[PDB]
Amino acid sequence: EVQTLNEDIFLKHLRERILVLFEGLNSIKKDDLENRLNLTINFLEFLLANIEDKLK
């Protein structure tokens, strides 16, 4: 029940590791949104250029 020096150190590192893991997870999540957004933009931009080619 008492909290030992070794436990405090181990808990403190694990805290840091989880926070680093969340940073990693948040980046993968944001890059995933960034890629799907860019893929739809590129599609729409390609479509827009097809349309304008046919209007020329």
Ligand SMILES: [Mn+2]
């Ligand atoms: Mn999170």
